[PDB]
From Swiss-Prot, chain D:
This is Portal protein. It is found in: Virion. The chain holds residues 52 to 101 of 806 of the full protein. Homododecamer. Interacts with the Cargo protein 1. Interacts with the major capsid protein. Forms the portal vertex of the capsid. Probably involved in head assembly, genome packaging, tail attachment, and genome ejection. Coiled coil: none annotated.
From Swiss-Prot, chains E, I:
It comes from Bacteroides phage crAss001 (Bacteroides phage PhiCrAss001). Signal peptide: none annotated. The chain holds residues 425 to 552 of 842 of the full protein. This is Cargo protein 1. Protein that is stored in high quantity in the viral capsid and may play a role during ejection. It is found in: Virion; Host membrane.
Length: 43, 151, 145, 46, 126, 143, 130, 143, 126
């Protein structure tokens, strides 16, 4: 889960920022985009 | 036609807040030509260079800097070819995405592979600037990682 | 050289400078092109003009996400007494639009949403109320008018 | 949806399907799109 | 900062009424009051007073009841009476009727305050 | 193909009406954002345009003051009638090369009208003083 | 291939800022400024303050699985003169869609007829062969 | 074939919008690289362009200061209106052969406007002093 | 070299704060301090001092507690108090609010240091 963004700049520590990137590796759905499986067949 | 020039939207609309900012710039060029010129040998060469900038406006000085930044980098990068490849993405998947970053202290513009960009919390918005979170995942050269993150 | 001008000249310049800049800033001809495509599809071309961030901004309305009430048989959408606009907004768009009125518990409501798309339902009601006003007849002090 | 290439089978007949295959569903050919795109492409140039 | 302002929709819209609502009394401030201009040069104002159109409504003095029933004032002081005549135009700063209704109300409380001050000027000198 | 453009012309005329009214609606929203402490309007407007808000009555429509957003055949010919009038005044030395550039960057048919009327009136007073200056020089030699 | 997986996260955080109202010293004109949360508000001058929560664009890069670089507020904040929360990343683009939908592309509207061209030319090639 | 270009014109108009915004996005990235100790900008910019960063408020969009990246029919005619105005000033000896080359290598419609206005104003003051110089020579002979 | 700089993305971005963080004290250097300009011509600075906008925050002297609770300073010295008011704008050098917040914070610590120096100038001469 994505860590709390509603924090002071003092508590946005180096492990806070590493937690946001670790969540990004954990990782797609949008509302106005086709799938990547859809677009790759088109390409 | 590719004539993408930065223009003043209202070129006949000068205000006093633009006039004060012009006066700060003109006096700042007064001090540096006072230091850099050695005792009236080249002071009147700089002075003839500076007098024709009184004709200008603050919005003129800004519209020149914006164009010189855009004129050089369109020709340096061949940006019309970058836009041609993304238009081919537009007629294929319906997505034309470009990233502007600083790499090596330079502004640089890249086109994004639509299969390698994740857009989150955009809403029903059509534009990609309106997203709250974007993830970009690609496989980079080791030279490109050292060209980008050496510091 | 502003003595040559008139009051209607000073106003016609301010109106054009506001319209010249924002047509070029927003690329408003493309906004109008998308709504004309709505016109040839559902017969409805709707645009909203609001203030967001202190700027005038113009948006085109999805005809599936606008409810028009008490309009009558009127053709125009300005003639409605009540309009409801419901769309799902980005959390950044809610904080870009209501940052000066969102309370800290309202911001805590946004971050502690479950986020299972992660967008916020934004309902906006536009309605005409009834205001009591007074019409006072007075006499000019200098003339009996 | 018809401009986006989506055919609702419930809109052109009373249905006695939900699987995306032609033996019971129907292909849509977008012949109404080119007509609309002239008129919006003319409006771009007016 | 809430004082006579409507800070909504990314803008700062006001009705013209200046709530001086920080600092303290002229005895409480080291600078002897909030300065609202070099004009007299020390234009010093305190935490209770209300300013509209270069006219300051004093919070120290109060409303005489003869000046309360007449002129139809509402508040206990003159600053608290100016805060009640602006309560409509505070959240609709751009209506023309509210700028009409505030311009009329702020003149009534102004002539009410000058009428009470000329009474007290005569009251102690007598 | 002109008669086939007539079949769809009815769809464009209601479209130009919405664009006329949404731009009048955008202009009134923009008049209200002016009185909201936004310093962006100090860059896109003049000094005289910044002071129209200082006068009372800026809460109402511009069509109640005589101003209308207009994209009609009368406005398009009025722009080119003023443009050809400027080039006709450029040659014969009635309009300056400085102010012809101001007409090229003007966006208001009242603005560019006042500039044509300005440079004419400046030059005819310069010709009027130059006529008497040569005449008084002729008489003071004779005197 | 001998290349490195480079993951870059671009995200909007929430920054606490302060809106301080002060009075001009020369004229009695109220002024508005935006400050960070560490700003010491100057009362004894009438400065009353309100604190807001505001978007702030952040950035972070992972290289492989063990390198974590450039985790900091994004240094090009595409800022606006009057809105402190309005910002974005460098990523600019558009969807070519119709009325909040998913884009029906040019290839998408021609792909039925390309698939049918492939089926009929299959029958052609088996008729040529036999 | 012009009506068949209309069917695909809708695809080009969204493309020109992305190119408009990506160039505004590139310009703001370039404004931030200026304040990062890069000596390349000392070769592609002027001296006045190097000093715009010295004033406060270079963190915001250029559209908040009145500047917009624009590829529209109004900008393309404004360029040729200034180009034909220059050749009309070249002959009749109102513009120099030196500065006509500066308009040819300018890239800004505000820059080349100021050069047309400069050479006009220099020459008319030279004609004004040449008129009085011949007049005072005539009078000092008579005196 | 880390001192008041953000050296990222191939550039050298700063908040304006000059960490003089090499050399040593004026007694330790053969040149009697790091010179930061010919202006007095020997503008000599040591390893502890912090410079912002031609104003040097001295590391030798310390914060009086009356000048600590008032002005809300954080560090033990004046250089270490200037290093804490720049900690936000250090990693976001290009935000307009951080340049606003640093310009205000660097003036508070400056008037705090001048206030402590006029105390000690009166303290020994008395």
């Amino acid at each position: 889960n994505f860590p709390r963004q509603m924090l002071p700049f003092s508590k946005k520590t180096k492990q806070w920022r590493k937690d946001c990137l670790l969540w990004a590796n954990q990782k797609n759905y949008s509302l106005v985009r086709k799938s990547v499986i859809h677009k790759k067949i088109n390409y | 036609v590719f004539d993408f020039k930065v223009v003043v939207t209202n070129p006949n609309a000068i205000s006093e807040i633009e006039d004060n900012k012009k006066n700060e710039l003109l006096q700042r060029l007064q001090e540096m030509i006072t230091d850099t010129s050695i005792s009236e040998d080249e002071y009147n060469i700089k002075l003839e260079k500076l007098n024709d900038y009184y004709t200008y406006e603050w919005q003129d000085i800004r519209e020149v800097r914006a164009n010189e930044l855009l004129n050089h980098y369109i020709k340096e990068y061949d940006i019309p070819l970058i836009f041609n490849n993304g238009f081919m993405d537009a007629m294929t998947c319906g997505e034309e995405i470009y990233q502007c970053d600083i790499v090596g202290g330079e502004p640089v513009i890249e086109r994004v592979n639509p299969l390698k960009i994740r857009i989150f919390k955009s809403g029903y918005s059509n534009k990609v600037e309106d997203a709250d979170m974007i993830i970009l995942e690609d496989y980079w050269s080791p030279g490109r990682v050292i060209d980008t993150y050496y510091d | 050289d502003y003595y040559t001008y008139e009051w209607q000249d000073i106003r016609e310049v301010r109106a054009n400078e506001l319209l010249n800049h924002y047509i070029k800033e927003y690329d408003i001809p493309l906004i109008f092109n998308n709504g004309f495509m709505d016109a040839m599809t559902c017969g409805e071309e709707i645009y909203q003009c609001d203030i967001v961030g202190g700027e005038p901004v113009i948006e085109r309305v999805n005809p599936l996400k606008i409810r028009i009430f008490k309009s009558g048989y009127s053709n125009k959408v300005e003639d409605a007494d009540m309009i409801i606009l419901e769309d799902y907004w980005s959390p950044g768009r809610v904080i870009d639009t209501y940052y000066d009125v969102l309370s800290p518990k309202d911001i805590k409501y946004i971050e502690t949403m479950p986020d299972y798309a992660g967008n916020l339902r934004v309902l906006r009601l536009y309605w005409k109320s009834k205001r009591k006003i007074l019409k006072v007849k007075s006499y000019d002090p200098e003339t009996g008018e | 949806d018809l401009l986006n290439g989506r055919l609702h089978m419930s809109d052109l007949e009373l249905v006695l399907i939900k699987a995306a295959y032609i033996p019971d569903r129907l292909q849509h050919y977008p012949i109404m799109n080119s007509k609309l795109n002239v008129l919006r492409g003319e409006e771009s140039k007016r | 900062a809430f004082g006579g302002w409507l800070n909504t929709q990314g803008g700062d819209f006001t009705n013209g009424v200046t709530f001086i609502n920080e600092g303290g009394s002229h005895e409480e401030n080291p600078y002897q009051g909030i300065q609202i201009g070099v004009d007299g040069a020390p234009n010093l104002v305190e935490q209770g007073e209300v300013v509209y159109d270069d006219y300051v409504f004093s919070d120290r003095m109060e409303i005489p009841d003869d000046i309360r029933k007449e002129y139809k004032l509402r508040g206990k002081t003159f600053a608290k009476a100016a805060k009640s005549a602006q309560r409509e135009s505070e959240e609709r700063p751009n209506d023309p009727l509210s700028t009409k209704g505030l311009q009329a109300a702020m003149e009534r409380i102004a002539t009410a305050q000058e009428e009470a001050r000329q009474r007290k000027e005569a009251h102690r000198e007598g | 193909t002109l008669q086939s453009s007539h079949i769809t012309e009815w769809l464009f005329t209601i479209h130009d009406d919405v664009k006329k009214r949404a731009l009048e609606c955008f202009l009134e929203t923009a008049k209200v954002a002016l009185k909201g402490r936004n310093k962006k309007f100090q860059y896109i407007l003049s000094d005289t345009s910044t002071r129209v808000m200082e006068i009372d009555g800026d809460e109402f429509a511009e069509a109640d003051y005589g101003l209308v957003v207009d994209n009609s055949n009368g406005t398009q010919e009025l722009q080119q009638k003023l443009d050809t009038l400027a080039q006709a005044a450029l040659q014969t030395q009635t309009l300056s090369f400085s102010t012809i550039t101001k007409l090229y960057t003007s966006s208001s048919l009242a603005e560019k009208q006042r500039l044509i009327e300005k440079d004419e009136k400046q030059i005819r007073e310069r010709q009027a003083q130059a006529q008497k200056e040569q005449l008084e020089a002729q008489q003071q030699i004779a005197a | 291939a001998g290349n490195l997986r480079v993951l870059r996260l671009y995200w909007k955080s929430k920054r606490k800022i302060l809106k301080v109202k002060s009075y001009d010293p020369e004229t009695g004109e109220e002024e508005w400024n935006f400050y960070p949360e560490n700003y010491v508000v100057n009362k004894e001058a009438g400065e009353e303050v309100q604190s807001f929560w505001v978007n702030e664009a952040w950035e972070g890069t992972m290289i492989g699985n063990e390198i974590f670089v450039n985790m900091r507020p994004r240094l090009i904040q595409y800022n606006r003169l009057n809105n402190p929360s309005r910002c974005h990343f460098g990523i600019v683009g558009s969807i070519y869609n119709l009325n909040d939908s998913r884009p029906f592309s040019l290839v998408d509207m021609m792909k039925p007829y390309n698939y049918l061209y492939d089926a009929i030319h299959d029958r052609l090639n088996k008729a040529i062969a036999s």
